[PDB]
Structures are given as C-alpha cells and as structure tokens.
Short mmCIF file of C-alpha atoms in Angstrom, two decimals:
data_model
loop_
_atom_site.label_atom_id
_atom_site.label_comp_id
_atom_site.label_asym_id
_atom_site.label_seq_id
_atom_site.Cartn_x
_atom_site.Cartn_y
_atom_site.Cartn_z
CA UNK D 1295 -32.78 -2.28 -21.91
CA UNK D 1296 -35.13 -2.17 -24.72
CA UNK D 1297 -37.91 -0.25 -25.09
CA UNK D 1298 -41.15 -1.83 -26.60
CA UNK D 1299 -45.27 -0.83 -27.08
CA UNK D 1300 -45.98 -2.50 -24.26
CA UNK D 1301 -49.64 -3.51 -23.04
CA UNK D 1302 -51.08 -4.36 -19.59
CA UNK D 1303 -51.41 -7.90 -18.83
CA UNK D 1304 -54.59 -8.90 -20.10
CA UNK D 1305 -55.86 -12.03 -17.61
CA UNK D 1306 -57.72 -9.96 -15.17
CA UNK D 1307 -60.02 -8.95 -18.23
CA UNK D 1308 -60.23 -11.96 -20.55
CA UNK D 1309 -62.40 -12.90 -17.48
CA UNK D 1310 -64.95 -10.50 -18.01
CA UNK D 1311 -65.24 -10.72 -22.00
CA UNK D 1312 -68.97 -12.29 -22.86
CA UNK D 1313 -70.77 -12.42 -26.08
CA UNK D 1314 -74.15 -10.28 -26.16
CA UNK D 1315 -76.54 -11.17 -29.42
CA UNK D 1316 -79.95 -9.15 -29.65
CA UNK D 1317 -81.94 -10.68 -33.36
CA UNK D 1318 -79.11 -10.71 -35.77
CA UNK D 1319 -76.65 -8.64 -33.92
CA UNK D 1320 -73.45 -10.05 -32.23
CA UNK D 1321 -71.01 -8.29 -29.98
CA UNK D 1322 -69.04 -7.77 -27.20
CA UNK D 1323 -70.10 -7.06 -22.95
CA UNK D 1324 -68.53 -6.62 -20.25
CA UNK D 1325 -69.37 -8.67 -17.07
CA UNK D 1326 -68.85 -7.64 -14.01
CA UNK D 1327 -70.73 -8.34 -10.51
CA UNK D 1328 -74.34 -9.16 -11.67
CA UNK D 1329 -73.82 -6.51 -14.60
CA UNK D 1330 -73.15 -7.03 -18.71
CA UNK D 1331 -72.03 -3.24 -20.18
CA UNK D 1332 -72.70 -3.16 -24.52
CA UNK D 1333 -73.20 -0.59 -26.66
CA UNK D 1334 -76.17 0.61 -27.01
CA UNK D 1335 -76.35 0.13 -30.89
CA UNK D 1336 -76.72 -3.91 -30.06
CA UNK D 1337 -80.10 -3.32 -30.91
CA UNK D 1338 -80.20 -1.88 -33.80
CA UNK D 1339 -80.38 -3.38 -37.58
CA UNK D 1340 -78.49 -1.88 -40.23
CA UNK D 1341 -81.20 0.25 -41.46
CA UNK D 1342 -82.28 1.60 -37.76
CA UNK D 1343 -77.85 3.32 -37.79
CA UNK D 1344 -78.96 5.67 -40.29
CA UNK D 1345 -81.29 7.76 -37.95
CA UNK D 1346 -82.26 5.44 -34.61
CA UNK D 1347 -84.33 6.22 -32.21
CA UNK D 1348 -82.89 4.42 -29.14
CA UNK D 1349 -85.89 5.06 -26.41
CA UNK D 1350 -88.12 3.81 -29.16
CA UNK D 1351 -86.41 1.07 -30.31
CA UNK D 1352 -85.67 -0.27 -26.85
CA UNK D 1353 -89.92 -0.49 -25.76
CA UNK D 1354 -89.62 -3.12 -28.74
CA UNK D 1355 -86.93 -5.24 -26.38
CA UNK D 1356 -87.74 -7.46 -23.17
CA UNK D 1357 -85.24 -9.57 -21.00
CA UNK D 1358 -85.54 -13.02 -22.59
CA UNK D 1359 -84.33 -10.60 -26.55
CA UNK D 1360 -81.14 -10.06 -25.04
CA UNK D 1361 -78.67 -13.53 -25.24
CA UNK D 1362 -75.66 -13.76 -22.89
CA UNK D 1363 -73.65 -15.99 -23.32
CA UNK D 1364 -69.81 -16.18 -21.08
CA UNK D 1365 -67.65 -19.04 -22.45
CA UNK D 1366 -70.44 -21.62 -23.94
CA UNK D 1367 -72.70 -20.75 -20.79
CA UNK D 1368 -75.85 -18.76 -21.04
CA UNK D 1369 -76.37 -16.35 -18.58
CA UNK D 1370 -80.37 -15.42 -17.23
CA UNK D 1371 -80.96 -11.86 -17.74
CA UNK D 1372 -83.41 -10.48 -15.00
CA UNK D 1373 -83.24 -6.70 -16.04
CA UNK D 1374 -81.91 -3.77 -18.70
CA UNK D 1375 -81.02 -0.30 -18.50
CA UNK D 1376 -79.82 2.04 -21.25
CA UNK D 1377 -77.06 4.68 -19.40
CA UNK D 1378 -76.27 6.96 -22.03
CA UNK D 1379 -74.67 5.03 -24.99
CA UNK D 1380 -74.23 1.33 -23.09
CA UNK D 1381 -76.97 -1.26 -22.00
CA UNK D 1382 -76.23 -2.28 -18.46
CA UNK D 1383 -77.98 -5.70 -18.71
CA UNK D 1384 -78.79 -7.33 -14.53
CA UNK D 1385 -77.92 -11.27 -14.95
CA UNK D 1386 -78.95 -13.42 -12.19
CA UNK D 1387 -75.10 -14.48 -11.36
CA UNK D 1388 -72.22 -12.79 -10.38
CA UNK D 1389 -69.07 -12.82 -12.37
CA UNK D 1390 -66.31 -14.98 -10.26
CA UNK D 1391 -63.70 -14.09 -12.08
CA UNK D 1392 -64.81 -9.93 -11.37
CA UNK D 1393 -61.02 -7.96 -10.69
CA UNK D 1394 -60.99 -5.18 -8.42
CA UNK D 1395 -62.28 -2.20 -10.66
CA UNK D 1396 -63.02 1.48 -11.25
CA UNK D 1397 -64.67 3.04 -14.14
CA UNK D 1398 -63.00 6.21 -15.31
CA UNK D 1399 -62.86 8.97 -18.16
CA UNK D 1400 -59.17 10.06 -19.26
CA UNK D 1401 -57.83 13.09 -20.90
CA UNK D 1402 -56.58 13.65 -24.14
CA UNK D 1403 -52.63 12.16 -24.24
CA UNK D 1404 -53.57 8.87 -21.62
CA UNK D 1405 -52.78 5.68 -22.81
CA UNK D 1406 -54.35 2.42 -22.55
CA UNK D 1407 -54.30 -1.33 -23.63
CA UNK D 1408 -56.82 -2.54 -25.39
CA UNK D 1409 -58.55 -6.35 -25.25
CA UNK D 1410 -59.82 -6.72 -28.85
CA UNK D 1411 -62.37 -9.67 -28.81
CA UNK D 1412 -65.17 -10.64 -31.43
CA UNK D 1413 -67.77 -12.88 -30.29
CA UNK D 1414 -66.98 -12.55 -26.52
CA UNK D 1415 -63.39 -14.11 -27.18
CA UNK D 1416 -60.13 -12.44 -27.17
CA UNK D 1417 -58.22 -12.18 -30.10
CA UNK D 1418 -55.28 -9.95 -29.73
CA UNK D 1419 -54.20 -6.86 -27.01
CA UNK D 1420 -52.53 -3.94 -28.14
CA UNK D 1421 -51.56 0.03 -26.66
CA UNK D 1422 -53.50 3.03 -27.73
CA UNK D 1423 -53.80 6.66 -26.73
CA UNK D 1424 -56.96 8.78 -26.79
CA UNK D 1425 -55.84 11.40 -29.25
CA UNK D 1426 -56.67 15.27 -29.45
CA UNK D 1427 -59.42 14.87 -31.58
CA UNK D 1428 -60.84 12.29 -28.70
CA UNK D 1429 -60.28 9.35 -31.53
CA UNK D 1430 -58.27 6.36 -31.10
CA UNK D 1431 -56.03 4.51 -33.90
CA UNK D 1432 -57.13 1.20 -32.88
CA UNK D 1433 -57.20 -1.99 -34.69
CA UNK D 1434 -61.25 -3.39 -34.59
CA UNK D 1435 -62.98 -5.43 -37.47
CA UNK D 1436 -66.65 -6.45 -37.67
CA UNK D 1437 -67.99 -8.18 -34.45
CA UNK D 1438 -65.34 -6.07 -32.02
CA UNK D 1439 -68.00 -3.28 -30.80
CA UNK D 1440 -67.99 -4.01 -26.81
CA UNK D 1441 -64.25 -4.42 -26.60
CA UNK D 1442 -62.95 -2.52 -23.91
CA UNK D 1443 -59.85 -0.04 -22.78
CA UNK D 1444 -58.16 0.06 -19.67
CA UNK D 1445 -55.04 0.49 -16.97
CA UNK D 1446 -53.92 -1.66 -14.20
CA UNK D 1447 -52.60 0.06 -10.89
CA UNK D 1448 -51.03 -3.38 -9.21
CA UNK D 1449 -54.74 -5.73 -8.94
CA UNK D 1450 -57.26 -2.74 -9.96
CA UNK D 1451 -58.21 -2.86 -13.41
CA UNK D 1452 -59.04 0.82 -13.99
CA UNK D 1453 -61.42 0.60 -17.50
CA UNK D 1454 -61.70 3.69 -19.73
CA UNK D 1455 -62.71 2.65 -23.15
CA UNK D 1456 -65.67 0.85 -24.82
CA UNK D 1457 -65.48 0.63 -28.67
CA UNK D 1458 -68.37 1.51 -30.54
CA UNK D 1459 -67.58 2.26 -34.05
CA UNK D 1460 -65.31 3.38 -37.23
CA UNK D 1461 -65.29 6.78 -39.02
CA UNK D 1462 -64.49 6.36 -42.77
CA UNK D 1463 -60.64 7.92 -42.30
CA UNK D 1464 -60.21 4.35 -40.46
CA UNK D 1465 -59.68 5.94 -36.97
CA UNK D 1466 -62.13 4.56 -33.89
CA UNK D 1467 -64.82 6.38 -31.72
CA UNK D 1468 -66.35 5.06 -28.15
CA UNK D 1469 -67.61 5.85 -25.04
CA UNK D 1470 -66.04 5.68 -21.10
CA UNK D 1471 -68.32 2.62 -18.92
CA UNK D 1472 -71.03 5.44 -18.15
CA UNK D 1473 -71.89 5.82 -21.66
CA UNK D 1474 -70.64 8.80 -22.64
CA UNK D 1475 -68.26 9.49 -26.18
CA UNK D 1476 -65.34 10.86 -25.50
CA UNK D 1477 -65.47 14.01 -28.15
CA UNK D 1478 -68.40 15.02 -30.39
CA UNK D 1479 -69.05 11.34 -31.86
CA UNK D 1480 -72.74 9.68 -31.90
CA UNK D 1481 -73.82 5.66 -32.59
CA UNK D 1482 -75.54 6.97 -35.45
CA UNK D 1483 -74.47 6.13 -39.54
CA UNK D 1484 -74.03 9.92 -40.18
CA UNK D 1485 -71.18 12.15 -41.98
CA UNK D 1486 -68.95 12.65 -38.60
CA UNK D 1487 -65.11 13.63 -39.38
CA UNK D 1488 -61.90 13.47 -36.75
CA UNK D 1489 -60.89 16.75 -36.26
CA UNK D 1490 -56.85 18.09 -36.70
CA UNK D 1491 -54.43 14.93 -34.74
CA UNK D 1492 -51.91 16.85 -33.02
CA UNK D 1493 -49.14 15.16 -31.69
CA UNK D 1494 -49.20 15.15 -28.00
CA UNK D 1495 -45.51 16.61 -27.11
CA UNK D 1496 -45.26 15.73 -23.42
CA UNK D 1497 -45.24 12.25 -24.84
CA UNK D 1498 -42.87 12.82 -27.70
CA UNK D 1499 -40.28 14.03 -24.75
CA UNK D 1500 -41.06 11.26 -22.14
CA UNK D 1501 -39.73 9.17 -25.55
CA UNK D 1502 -36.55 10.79 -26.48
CA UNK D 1503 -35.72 10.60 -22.01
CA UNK D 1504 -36.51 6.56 -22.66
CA UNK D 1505 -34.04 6.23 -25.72
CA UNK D 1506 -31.24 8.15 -23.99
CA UNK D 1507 -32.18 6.16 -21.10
CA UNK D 1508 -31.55 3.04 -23.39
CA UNK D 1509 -28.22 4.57 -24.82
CA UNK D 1510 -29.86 6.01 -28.14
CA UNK D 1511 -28.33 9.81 -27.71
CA UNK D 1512 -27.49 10.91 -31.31
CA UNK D 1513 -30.15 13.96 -31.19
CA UNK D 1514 -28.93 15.93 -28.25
CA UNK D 1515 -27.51 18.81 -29.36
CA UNK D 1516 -25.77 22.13 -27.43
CA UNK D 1517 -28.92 23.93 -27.21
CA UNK D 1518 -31.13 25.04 -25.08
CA UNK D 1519 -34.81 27.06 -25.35
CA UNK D 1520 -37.94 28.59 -23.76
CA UNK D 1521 -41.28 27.01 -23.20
CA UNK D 1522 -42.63 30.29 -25.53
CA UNK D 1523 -39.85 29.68 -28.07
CA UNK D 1524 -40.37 26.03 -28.22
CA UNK D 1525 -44.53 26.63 -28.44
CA UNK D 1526 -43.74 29.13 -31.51
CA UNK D 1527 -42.33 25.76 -33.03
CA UNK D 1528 -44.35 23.00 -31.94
CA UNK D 1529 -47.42 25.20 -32.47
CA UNK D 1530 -46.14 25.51 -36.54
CA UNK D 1531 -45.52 21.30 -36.77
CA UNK D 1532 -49.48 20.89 -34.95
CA UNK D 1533 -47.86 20.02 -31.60
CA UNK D 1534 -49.80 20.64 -28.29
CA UNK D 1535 -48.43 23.67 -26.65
CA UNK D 1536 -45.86 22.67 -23.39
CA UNK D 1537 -47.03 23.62 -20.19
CA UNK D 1538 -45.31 24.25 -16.60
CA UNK D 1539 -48.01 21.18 -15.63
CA UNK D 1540 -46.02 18.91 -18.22
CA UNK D 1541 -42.60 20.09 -17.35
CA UNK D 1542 -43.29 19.14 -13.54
CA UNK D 1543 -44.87 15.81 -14.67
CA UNK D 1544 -41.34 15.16 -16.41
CA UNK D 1545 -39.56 15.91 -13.42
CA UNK D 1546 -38.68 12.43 -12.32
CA UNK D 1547 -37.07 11.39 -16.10
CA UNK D 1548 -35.00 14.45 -16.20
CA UNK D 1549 -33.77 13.54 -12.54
CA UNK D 1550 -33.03 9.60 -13.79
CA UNK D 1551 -30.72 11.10 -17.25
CA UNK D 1552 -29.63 14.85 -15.79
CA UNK D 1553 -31.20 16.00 -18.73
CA UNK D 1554 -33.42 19.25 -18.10
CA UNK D 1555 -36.76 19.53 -19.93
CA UNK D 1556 -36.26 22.16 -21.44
CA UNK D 1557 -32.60 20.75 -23.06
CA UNK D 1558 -34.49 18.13 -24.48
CA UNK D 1559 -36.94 20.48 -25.78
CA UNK D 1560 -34.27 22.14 -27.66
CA UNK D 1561 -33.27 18.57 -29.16
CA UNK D 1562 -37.36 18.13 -30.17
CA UNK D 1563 -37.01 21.61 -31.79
CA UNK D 1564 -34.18 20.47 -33.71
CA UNK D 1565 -35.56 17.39 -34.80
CA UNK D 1566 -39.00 18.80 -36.04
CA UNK D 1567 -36.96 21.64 -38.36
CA UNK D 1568 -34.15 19.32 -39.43
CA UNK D 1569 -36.13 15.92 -39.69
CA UNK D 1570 -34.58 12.40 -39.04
CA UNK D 1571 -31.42 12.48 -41.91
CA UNK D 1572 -32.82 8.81 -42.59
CA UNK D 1573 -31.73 8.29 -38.66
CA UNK D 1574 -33.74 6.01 -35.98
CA UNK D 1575 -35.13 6.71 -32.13
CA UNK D 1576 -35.49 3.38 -30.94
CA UNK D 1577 -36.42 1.77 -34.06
CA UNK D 1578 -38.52 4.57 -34.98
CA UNK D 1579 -38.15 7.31 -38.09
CA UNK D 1580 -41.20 9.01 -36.55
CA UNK D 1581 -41.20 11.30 -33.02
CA UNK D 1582 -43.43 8.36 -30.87
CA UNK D 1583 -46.36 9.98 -29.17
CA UNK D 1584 -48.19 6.96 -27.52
CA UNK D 1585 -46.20 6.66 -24.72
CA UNK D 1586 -46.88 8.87 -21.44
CA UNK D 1587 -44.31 9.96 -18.50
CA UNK D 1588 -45.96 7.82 -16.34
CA UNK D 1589 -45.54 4.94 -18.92
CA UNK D 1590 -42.17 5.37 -19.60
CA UNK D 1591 -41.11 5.08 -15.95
CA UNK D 1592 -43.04 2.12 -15.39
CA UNK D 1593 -41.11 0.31 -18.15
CA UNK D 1594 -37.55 1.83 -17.45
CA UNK D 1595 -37.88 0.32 -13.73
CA UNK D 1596 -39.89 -2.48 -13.98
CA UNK D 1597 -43.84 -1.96 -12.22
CA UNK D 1598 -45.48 -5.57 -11.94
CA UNK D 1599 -49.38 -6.74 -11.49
#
C-alpha cells in the first residue's frame, strides 16, 4: 500500500544523455545508434531567439562546429541534419549502451518521466503529464534544453518528450524526437501564452479508485449520476468532458474495488461543489490529475523493467 509520483527507472536512459556545445552554447542530446537528437536552437546566440532564421543560420555550421562529448569522451561527428525543431547529428560510433526504443507523440492526459540533465549529466528524474494546453509543469533550469521524456513497456524505452524552452507563466514547451511541438509553441523569444489548463478528469478518477484501493474511502457518498449530468459539472470547474472511451478505459479499476464509474463520478461531483472540508486523498488537498488508468494499475499490482 502506498501510493507515490512514481517515475520509470531511469538506467536505460542515463546511457544515452551526452553534452552537445555549438560556440557558446551548451546542452543536452540524445545518443542513440550512430545518432545525437538536440534542439535545434543549439545554434543560436541570444540575439539570433528573438527572430532566427534556422536554414540560414545552419549554412554558417560544418561538422567539426558541433562538440559531442558522452561522459569525458569526444565523439567524431561525420554529418548533420535539421528534422523539424531537432539536429540529428551522424557520429562515427554507435552508442553501446543504446535500449530497445521507439519514438512516439502522445495525447493530451499521457504521462511520462522525465531525465532532467544539464551538461549531458543527470541530475534528478521526476513524473509529468502533457497537459491540455500541450504544456508540461516540469522542473528545467538553464543548461536542461535536450532533456528528454519517456515510458518503459518491460526493456523498450518508448521516448516522447524533448525540452526546448520556458514560457514566462513558468510552465515548459518541447517537441516529440521528430521535431515537432506538441501545441502551437515555436524556438523563437516571442510573446507565446499557455492556453486554459483543464484538469484531465479520467485521471482525477483513476486517483480516487487508487486511494480507495489503498483504504482512503471518506468521499464516497450514496450517489450516483450521468455522464451528461456529470459533464454539466466538470464542464463549470474547467474539467475535460467524460467520454464512453474513458469509462471503458476505467473498466479494469472499477472491476479491482466494485466501484462503477459512474459512482465514483458522483463522489468527483461532490467533491468539486463541496471542496475538501480541510480533508486529504492520499496526502493530497487537491483532486491529482497526473496519474493515468494505465498508471495506476501498474503501481497497485506491481509492473517491473
């Protein structure tokens, strides 16, 4: 019992992290095979953020510009590539330490760990979720652009995130390892705002099953609703509207308690319109929305790597 914000082991990755430098720039890569991902922005000065010109700035870089370096050891880089918003950099060796891997985009709600390194070292690891607004609430200083997201299914390290940069309201923006942002973001220093952070409810629920799973059963209550009644409510506290698709994914934690879905949606109804009373959910005064169904299970029974 217990029920903790738990991360992936984070061996299989330390073993990628390297340190990529371009001038006066340091940051974070990615090595795997004969391949080093980084943002794009690596070669950039401060001055080129505020309107850069990436094809242009790029003619200005050859091979021998870009330093590699993985654990004291510099790597030969034979070739470069911009894909989007990363640099794949070719190196003339193979990682040995390269997991089993897949490069994938997630939805809105998916949760990850996250291997926060500065200057190709790793310096903490931590769980996040790709919010609404396609921002993270991460935890990155200077130096930890290049520090990557990701899921393990058993040996397959499954990444999803690259951080590139801050927004002002102190919430994180990156790409997936093609390049791409996940929501309307850019690697340029212009006025870009997070849009409204809902709270993603099929989360919130997968919660409250863990604490009654873990004995923590104060909030159920007689009552009972509707997915359209419950949506009229959720929809008023900037919830994400409850689908069949999310009731069916919470099938297998309202089989474990005996505790229908939409039971426990009457309990979340209650919650939102009566608050806490000064009460706790598994050390929490705040509905927890950063862990999935999925997530939940795994912990509650145990999943090794």
């Amino acid at each position: 019992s217990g029920f903790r914000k738990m991360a992936f082991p984070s061996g299989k990755v330390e073993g990628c992290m390297v340190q990529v430098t371009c001038g006066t720039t340091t940051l974070n890569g990615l090595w795997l095979d004969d391949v080093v991902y980084c943002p794009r922005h690596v070669i950039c000065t401060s001055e080129d953020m505020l309107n850069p010109n990436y094809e242009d700035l790029l003619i200005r870089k050859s091979n021998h510009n870009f330093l590699v370096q993985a654990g004291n050891v510099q790597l030969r880089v034979i070739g470069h590539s911009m894909q989007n918003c990363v640099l794949k950099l070719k190196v003339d060796t193979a990682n040995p330490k390269t997991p089993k891997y897949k490069f994938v985009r997630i939805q809105p709600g998916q949760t990850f760990s996250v291997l926060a390194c500065y200057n190709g070292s790793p310096s903490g690891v931590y769980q996040c979720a790709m919010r609404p607004n396609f921002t993270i609430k991460g935890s990155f200083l200077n130096g930890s652009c290049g520090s990557v997201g990701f899921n393990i299914d058993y040996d397959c390290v499954s990444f999803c995130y690259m951080h590139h940069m801050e927004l002002p309201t102190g919430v994180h923006a990156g790409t997936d390892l093609e390049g791409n942002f996940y929501g309307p973001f850019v690697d340029r220093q212009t006025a870009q705002a997070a849009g409204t952070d809902t709270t993603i409810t099929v989360n919130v629920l997968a919660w409250l099953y863990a604490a009654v799973i873990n004995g923590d059963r104060w909030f159920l209550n007689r009552f009972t609703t509707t997915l359209n009644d419950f949506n009229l409510v959720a929809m008023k506290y900037n919830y994400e509207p409850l689908t069949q698709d999310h009731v069916d994914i919470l099938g297998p934690l309202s089989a474990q308690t005996g505790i229908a879905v939409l039971d426990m949606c009457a309990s979340l109804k209650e919650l939102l319109q009566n608050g806490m009373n000064g009460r706790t959910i598994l050390g929490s005064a705040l509905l927890e929305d950063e862990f999935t169904p999925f997530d939940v299970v795994r912990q509650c029974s145990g999943v090794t790597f």
